[PDB]
Amino acid sequence: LEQIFIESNEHNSHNQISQFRHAVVRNKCKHNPTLTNLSFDTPVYFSIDEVVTYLENMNNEV
Amino acid sequence: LEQIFIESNEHNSHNQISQFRHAVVRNKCKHNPTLTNLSFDTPVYFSIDEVVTYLENMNNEVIGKLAGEGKPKLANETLVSDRDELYFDAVQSFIVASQAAATKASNGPFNGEFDRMILRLHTR
């Protein structure tokens, strides 16, 4: 899951490794609220495109 | 004991471990009164059903929200000094928490986490 998208070339990896991993963790927590609370490795249904949009907005926030 | 009665599959497994084992240790001191000081692992008597019942109890945790009403409230309006000494006795059914002022109540912070665990603890 890290392999497909994240790449070695971009040197912006420093924090954004965690930015992405934590984004997925958190929106996992939210998208399945019936469950206790969701983490990285869990194979529980989820939508990531809205994490992309969320990245856009939190890039936009003021 | 750890792996017999707990798994690490879950993200929140660690807190289940915490409360489970605190419960079992207080349980087996509840059993053995004689010795002045006892340790967790040190062999002494305990029972499966007591843990099962306390887990089921706090799986339905509720308290009263009003000032000076911070303890789990029963159907009988009574409030309990200590969680274990009455819950381990037998599982009891508490009223619903609703925003209505008369039955103003607070949700459990740990509630809902135990429901997945207990049914498989039963199955095995």
Add this chain to the structure above:
Amino acid sequence: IGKLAGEGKPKLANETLVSDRDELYFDAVQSFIVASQAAATKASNGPFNGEFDRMILRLHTR
């Protein structure tokens, strides 16, 4: 700790305030009161707590 402004400091059961974290803990164990969400009683959990349990019980065994 207490969320209250001006109390960025360990809060006791008596809510006493000690400037240095060092000598408070070495002298003896501390019976801090746990947080509840109500604003007057609202408080913050330590990031230290939650992750040290297994080490502490194994060391208690040893």
